[PDB]
Symmetry: D2
Subunit: 456 residues, 4 copies
């Protein structure tokens, strides 16, 4: 079963916004549902669904700005894009390794946690097989309701408009159903001024070398935050700029270890989504807070220990902490950034993070590892907001990820699904790779179920 491209002017069955892991999992699940080898009823399928994926990136990439050398996956390779739904799938990580002549070699490592670089290539290899149905260099700018009968009051399709990233021309594609799977945006502290020397972690590998071109120069470089991203950048900087002075600034008193214990981590199981979803708003908010240390503002223990050991090595060489080349400043917040000075160094003013004073740093660059927001789907959906039930000022995704729309305004064949931004309703596993294989399988059934039943 090879998915063929649909002409731009034809009515699509599905239009996915984004082609990151979440969308890729849906594409794979669709391939597998139409594979007569994997699914018996697939022989009876006559027509290929008309499908298209829109991705703003020029080609498949997985958080390329954070592909720090030596950087490792944080989940078992078994939770790849296909295995948890079907180990027989040709899209498993193990089958990818086999296709590359690397299976025996990966096995000899005895590791569940491949390099981020390797796992990106696996997903890239997966993504390449859907090149006929993916349009790269397309940034979706809006989703617009359409009525096949304009004189009526019922919406039965959607228009998706995207801007070509190279040339800036706007194209439209019409579809019965939309999936929005666009991940998250860089989250910056509101207090920080805009400056080329102030860069979010997500652009670390991509944009910092352009700013600090000489690797041997004695720069002063600061890192803000204490999550995984901060730890990785802080650690890497010591290798990438050997003569640099680095400072880690955090409002917490310490880097804290991620919770990887097996009982707690069962919250990430695919079957647990039903259980999480069915809870009340108060119980869900309570559960997410209670299990926060699995995912947010936490560092893998092994990395913490490495950094800590480097700190002690500095202590051996020099007992005076103020003289260390690489330093951690706990329980601090940035009150002022001076960035209009003649010199190439900004002046960062610090105070105690403690509730109701401190030093100053001269830095060539500030890396801001302050996490992400997942609200970008809102802007894409503003023109379809009036289709929601009257008075409801927020999108409400059902268990199957389809947003609630007023039944009398929107036809049953038309719909919009959200992926990767539903943590509040679906649990901590929603933004991760943990349930993507199973969720992909669910999504295909939700969207293409009518066609798949006919063949079944």
């Amino acid at each position: 079963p090879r998915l063929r491209s649909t002409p731009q002017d034809e009515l699509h069955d599905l239009l996915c916004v984004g082609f990151g892991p979440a969308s890729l999992a849906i594409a794979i699940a669709l391939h597998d549902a139409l594979d007569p080898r994997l699914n018996k009823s697939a022989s009876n399928i006559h027509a290929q669904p008309k499908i298209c994926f829109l991705e703003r990136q020029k080609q498949f990439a997985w958080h390329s700005g954070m592909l720090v050398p030596g950087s490792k996956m944080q989940i078992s390779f078994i939770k790849d894009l296909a295995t948890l739904r079907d180990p027989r799938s040709s899209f498993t990580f193990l089958n990818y390794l086999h296709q590359k002549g690397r299976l025996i070699h990966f096995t000899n490592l005895s590791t569940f946690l491949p390099a981020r670089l390797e796992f990106e290539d696996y997903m890239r290899w997966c993504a390449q097989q859907f090149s006929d149905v993916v349009a790269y260099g397309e940034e979706v700018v809006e989703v617009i309701p359409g009525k096949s009968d304009p004189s009526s009051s019922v919406v039965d399709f959607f228009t998706v408009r995207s801007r070509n990233v190279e040339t800036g021309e706007i194209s439209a594609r019409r579809t019965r159903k939309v999936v929005i799977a666009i991940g998250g945006t860089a989250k910056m502290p509101s207090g920080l001024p805009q400056d080329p020397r102030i860069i979010h972690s997500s652009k670390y590998c991509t944009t910092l070398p352009a700013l600090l071109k000489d690797k041997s120069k004695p720069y002063n470089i600061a890192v803000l935050g204490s999550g995984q991203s901060a730890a990785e950048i802080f650690h890497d900087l010591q290798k990438r700029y050997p003569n640099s002075r680095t400072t880690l600034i955090m409002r917490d008193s310490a880097m804290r270890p991620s919770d990887d214990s097996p009982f707690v981590n069962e919250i990430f199981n695919p079957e647990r989504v039903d259980k999480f979803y069915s809870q009340s708003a108060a119980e869900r908010q309570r559960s997410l807070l209670a299990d926060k240390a699995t995912n947010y503002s936490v560092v893998r223990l092994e990395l913490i220990e490495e950094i800590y050991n480097d700190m002690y090595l500095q202590r051996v060489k020099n007992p005076d902490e103020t003289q260390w080349q690489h330093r951690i400043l706990p329980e601090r917040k940035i009150t002022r950034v001076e960035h209009h000075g003649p010199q190439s160094r900004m002046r960062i003013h610090l105070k105690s993070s403690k509730p109701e004073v401190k030093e100053t740093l001269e830095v060539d660059a500030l890396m801001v590892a302050t996490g992400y927001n997942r609200n970008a789907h809102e802007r894409l959906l503003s023109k379809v907001q009036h289709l929601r039930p009257t008075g409801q000022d927020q999108w409400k995704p059902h268990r199957d990820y389809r947003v609630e729309m007023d039944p009398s305004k929107v036809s049953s064949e038309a719909g919009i699904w959200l992926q990767g931004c539903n943590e509040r309703t679906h649990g901590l596993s929603d933004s991760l790779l943990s349930v993507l294989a199973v969720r992909g399988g669910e999504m295909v059934q939700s969207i293409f179920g009518e066609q798949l039943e006919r063949a079944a």
Copy 2:
């Protein structure tokens, strides 16, 4: 320097209540301060301080009710009773091993974490060297103020009364200064009824075998809680009663790993007590909460993984969880205990721990691993409460552990020190062994400083 006993009728310089690790650390620090080999000025000491320790236990023991087989220390052997203050001390763990012909053998293990049994013997070996100045089988029942001039309004000594545990006779001992180092009491949920089949974790090894005498019998045994004590008991029961059905009942959703990461665990450093003490009440309460996972309601990762692996082994044998010999029931609370029935089994009624229904268990015994309180010193000190500054209805320990008393009611030579119950003012390390060597050294200086300066 061998500490000789003081006659019961003589005025003591110091009377310590309790002879657990905290008091033992003080005894060792005193020995070391008078040791001319360790402290040069010690030659000039002419008089041995008149000192006595009162312990209710018949002999030195360290949480004997929880000496579960295979049970391990949770801190490095380096934080023993002497090393952090002076590695040259004859009371180090390494010197103990040397004295037992076991030093090379411990070394070959490559472990920082000795069995609790071994560390108890080390402390027992330490304790034995002070047998002249320790009175076992003495439970202190009250501390009473005394005035060397009864017609005056100034208190300058204390009377300590203790009841002989075997024979019940009351003895009095007079002292200028008192240390109260009595650890904690068993904490029981208020809702649970009194019953011989309901036993606190602290009495697990000591009292459960008396209740369930036949090791091969198919008992039903429940464990309440999800901290270290619960995990250890739950795990051990499977070895101790091979044919038993065990249930772990917890209000939390999972066992959670203790935080042993190196940056966070620096809060346990001796030098950090100054920093913690100097903070405000709000900041201290905030800090203790933030670092709770280092010590409370947490299980060492390795034990969690073991228990989890045992659970998966049960899954391999039987896919139906309700049929498992050993089970965990998360997010539950006990609403009712039926314990007046004719049969030897109580009936435990369960409900969801979730805020505003569930099963019933028939159990031969309920092990209650619900932690400890440290308020027992209050009852001992009721008759000295009037010596506090007017209106102050709680004991306030200074940095050096001496409680605040009204300067015009209490002479400068008389005082009371608290040890092991000061977490609120001194930090998380207060109840542990972490700072005992250093704290012991501090205590000796605070209490015997005037004499030690004369020789200095």
Copy 3:
């Protein structure tokens, strides 16, 4: 593709002796070669090959006498019966877990090394799918050459005779090709007398409980050897007989760790068989000796450390080694066994293992963990020996495992293949599970290649 049984009187294409992992891997590879889903050319296959497997065991079991509780696999689950040849196979370990509803649960363990019990069930589950073509309770007793034209001098088939284990009746089955995959036999020291109290490790779980029925009795039990089997039995005995005195007797000075380092362990790679096979007899013998510590007379480090820790715990309780409940006696050999005494205890006489005296032990049982031989195929093949090239007094397997036979005495369609006894020619991976998936694939091509090419 479901393999149907062949009537006993029909000429088979293949007859496999044994249905252990090696034969099971061949069955799976055949299933996969005929699976049109996995192999495209398989559609064109018209006729199912006539195949049969003969197994002496009543049902599939994997070293059941050594299924010690808690006993673990020593290779990655990835080297299962199918994955290294094809990750898409329905016979992978991961697909088995999926079929049992256990995939997510195994994943949460983060282990490459499943319990031996679990891996046995996986293989059992695999084996069950071939029940139509496997005859259990059949012990093959001889292989006899046949000539379709008896007046000629050319052998073109083989007769395989097996004795029914329950009823003892002899059945014959004729085949063009034979595979002998019968594993190894218990290896006993020649010096030891025959006695019910002297039991090889391979019968430990199965036969020792019949001899020592009371688990609480204070037996004396000895273990001879220092390989993995000895370590496991010695360790287990302490749990299985809590009041017993156990002795480990070894001629070496210590238990030695298995080599699991990644560069050395590449010898176990499937591609390395070509390289090993092509070497001279002297170079192969040299290589096997050099890499012996990967597999023979070695104990997994983690088990050594456990046992060692138990020994140190005994030291803590009692400093006098001669009084320990569980002891290791290094550098000893057994010179005499007294087993005609009135009492239930044999008397074992010991001497120094050192080249050119010692204690005596009274034991209820001696467990002999002295490894295996793989020469049992010789007895099965005695009547076909005359078919070898003149003067050649040993079976010579080619790279593809087919033994050399005189071309003028044996027709090209007839042949005999050896599996699991070819370490001398094919390398250390030959007796293990390491190359079974790939070897199975090779074997199917070697044996059924002509038919598979026609469809190709």
Copy 4:
């Protein structure tokens, strides 16, 4: 007790050649034997023994040419220079940490294996306390027998002559007793030509940067060998020369893991020296061979795994091994070195290491990590050879390390002791730090016993 210097012209009680760890352990043991705090009888000592140490290095250093960044100790810090003999000693590693204000900080690492840099500083700190009795920049060139009565036939003292390393002047010092503790020499393959580009591992940090001054240059660098030194250099080169192509050449098929298992490693226990020494020459040679993997031609597992992981990362980027930046060439030997060419690169000719052809490498430098010999003491002792028993052409050290000399030629007060070269008679622990504390204690008793008994 502070050891004061002896005038050069006075008869010494002891003259030690070398001031590495072995000699330092003797100095510490002497300090401790005279310390009235540690040894009670020490008060009665009236006279300080006249002692001197001669060291060719300008100051204390511990294998400075191999202080590779991140390089770690391979034995527990507990086997330092004093602890195994006396934990109360002021020369323990833990007391050193305390003296540096680093004790709490080392403890928080939870490691038994300090950096080689840290352990060097510890020993340096130890060494500094004996600066009065150590002469640096003195290379001992010969040991000469002396007779206090020249007309007699009895030798009763020794003359030790050393050359000043800076100025080259020869000085003589007379002593009753000599200790030779000079470690080992660089061992080079006889086949390799002399060349500045061919450097032994022992001079890696010291001399390679002088040869290859530009760290960013694309050099080709080869490493010969497969022991710990080779692995460390090979690994380090990748960090030190990021753009370089490195090749590891080894005659073995793989890097092999050091044996660190606890039962085997008991051979390193101090008490085991008696047992080893008492064995025959054949049994000792047999034992050393059997336990070789503890110490020789082996790499710590963790380093092997790191290097292996780096190799697999190269495989991910490029599947063609011949194109890798860093390569391992197993089972090779160097047959020819071309080093008279005009270019700065030598041409290394390789062949199979296999017993009775291969590539060529162009390299800027060859690092030769081929281990050490310990025969340098022979040259120092040639002029005293005639004092041995007639016909005996090798030095025979007793259990107490004193060489056998003819009783009628050498007076009982005069003697020579060997340290660090006695592996053949005393075991594998002889060249290591494992028994230095205890051996130091033994040596002091052997040499100064008569004086120490008088005070006892």
